[PDB]
Amino acid sequence: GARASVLSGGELDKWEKIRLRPGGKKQYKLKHIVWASRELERFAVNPGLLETSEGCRQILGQLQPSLQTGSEELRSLYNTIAVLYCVHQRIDVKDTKEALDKIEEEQNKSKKKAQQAAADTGNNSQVSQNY
């Protein structure tokens, strides 16, 4: 339907620029795109949503409230989508890391504000891994 492509010409180039990691050497490729699509179809979501910045936003917003009841399988998607979505809004984050902060910071402002005390505190962070 009217060229079922995720990223256009100018977008494709920039896409290849961004990398999976900030201090890595592995850049983004079509694999990372088509991949998320093959998975979306499993999450009751069409891969066509990636053919529109407006849609890429709904994806992150949908899985957002599901990031709690989901494993890495959903964590990886959010990452990729974050980079792609940015591309459409004319963004080329230095890495998949700057992409998550650019979308998280917007929400952090409200968090650190609403809390500004119960969202950090001093010493009170525990952790216990399994075997």
Nearest residue relative to ligand PBU (C-beta): 31
Site string for ligand PBU, 72-111 (x = CB under 6 A): x---x--xx-------------------------------
Among 17, 21, 109, 112, binds ligand PBU (CB under 6 A): 21
Task: Kindly state the tokens that stand for 70.
Answer: 């989901």
Taking alpha carbons only, the member of 20, 21, 11 closest to residue 86 is 11
Give the C-alpha separation, 126 to 117, whole Å: 18
3-state secondary structure of 27: strand
Among 3, 25, 31, 113, binds ligand PBU (CB under 6 A): 31
Task: Kindly state the tokens that stand for 119.
Answer: 């969202």
Which residues make up the interface to ligand PBU (CB under 6 A)? 20-21, 26, 31-32, 35, 72, 76, 79-80
